[PDB]
């Protein structure tokens with residue numbers, strides 16, 4: 001058999017006490033009242049996840065697959081990639097990354113302390129000398145926050161990661177490769193090269209370039225678990241097409257054989273849990289690996305399905321295709337052939353794909369294009385999403401300090417949206433004012449990479465990424481207004497009129513502070529007043545070093561870009 005996992009029966013175990021019910025404080029009810037709708041996943045559901053992820057994989061690889069692969073390799077051959085030094089690798093480690101089993105932590109790595117650096121060197125030397133010994137990994141259950149959807153509870157996802165010293169070695173060999181190769185191989189199809197605005201631009205331009213557009217998202221069931229040894233050796237052979245240092249070629253070969261293809265799973269108590277023969281969800285190449293493999297299989301499946309003039313957009317396991325419609329019947333037939341092809345390549349669907357004839361109704365990366373109007377009254381497309389999970393996570397973060405602040409990532413990514421502006425900005429600026437913590441930098445994630453960001457820099461960060469229009473958008477679409485309102489009903493969030501009222505208060509309190517706080521008041525909350533201020537380009541915006549921001553995806557990859 002080619003089983004994704006085999007298990008010993010040892011349990012997947014927590015590192016600390018786990019909360020599942022929403023923590024409540026004095027601030028909780030101002031945001032939401034239906035507390036029993038919000039939950040965190042815990043290891044107590046890890047057994048259920050183990051069932052879902054454990055299955056046999058069969059792969060039948062045809063001429064389309066090999067044709068597409070040869071093309072990808074030809075493009076990869078044009079990539080030149082560099083080895084990172086120990087220090088450069090060390091500075092990309094998040095301050096709160098999991099510590100080494102070998103008696104040093106993430107801060108020791110970042111400070112380049114001699115015990116960390118000595119060990120990292122010993123790990124590197126071992127990778128070069130040994131290309132066969134399976135590398136130990138830790139299996140953990142992720143604690144993530146959701147809203148119940150009987151339309152109730154998701155089991156915890158799994159995180160599989162090697163030791164801190166190995167992770168730093170992965171950066172040395174592969175950070176430059178994973179940061180640059182995917183855009184070269186996939187071109188405009190590589191989703192992580194785009195800001196939310198550029199993503200929208202790509203999708204709308206792509207949609208308009210078809211005579212009769214049809215689009216679909218493809219949901220692979222348990223994508224990580226569908227990735228086979230072959231898939232992972234095919235990824236490596238793509239990596240080796242690059243112009244690389246001989247030490248990097250050797251480390252990539254080694255990491256592939258010893259880590260990427262598979263390895264033993266160890267719980268937090270040090271017990272052997274079993275064996276993985278699929279994608280590790282917590283390695284540097286998780287995102288890039290998933291993007292390459294998804295694109296390969298999808299492109300091949302498009303050829304199999306004889307889809308006409310198709311354009312793909314791929315972010316890891318997330319896939320959207322836009323092509324030329326052949327009528328509703330023929331399109332449905334094409335999708336079943338596409339799905340059959342993907343299934344043959346070991347990427348069977350969860351939800352079967354369905355043709356869509358309205359761009360706004362296509363969800364990909366949990367997002368969709370929507371329409372609003374700017375200052376001049378012109379129609380503007382922008383990226384939004386269903387606000388349920390952002391608001392459930394916000395409710396959690398209202399009562400709990402967490403290492404990654406999702407509200408802040410969401411404000412950054414969804415700044416032009418009705419719900420991020422009216423609810424998230426209003427709510428969190430209100431708390432930060434009260435606590436006098438406006439100037440305190442908070443950690444957040446964009447495309448999997450960690451950033452340290454000061455909420456006082458939101459106006460200029462937003463201007464740089466979204467333009468000044470993100471502060472002027474009005475007259476959102478009925479479908480969008482209705483989705484937001486239905487979500488507020490579900491969670492028991494105050495209706496929008498209450499938030500407008502609150503934001504005028506938050507705005508005046510910020511203005512009163514003067515300076516950066518007043519800029520936040522001025523720009524972020526101009527929508528809240530009838531008497532509108534003049535929003536001019538912020539001189540600070542042009543000075544922001546926003547390189548590395550929307551270059552690549554690094555989910556699971558232990559990346560810090562501050």
Ligand SMILES: C[C@@H]1C[C@H](C)CN(C(=O)c2cc(Br)ccc2NC(=O)CCC(=O)N2CCOCC2)C1
Nearest residue numbers: 417418421422473474475476481496497500527528
């Ligand atoms: C009770 C709320 C319902 C929301 C849909 C809009 N709304 C807002 O406060 C609002 C919030 C943001 Br953020 C952006 C715009 C908002 N208001 C509107 O879209 C109302 C229409 C509006 O602002 N104008 C349309 C007519 O010309 C002048 C401009 C009130």
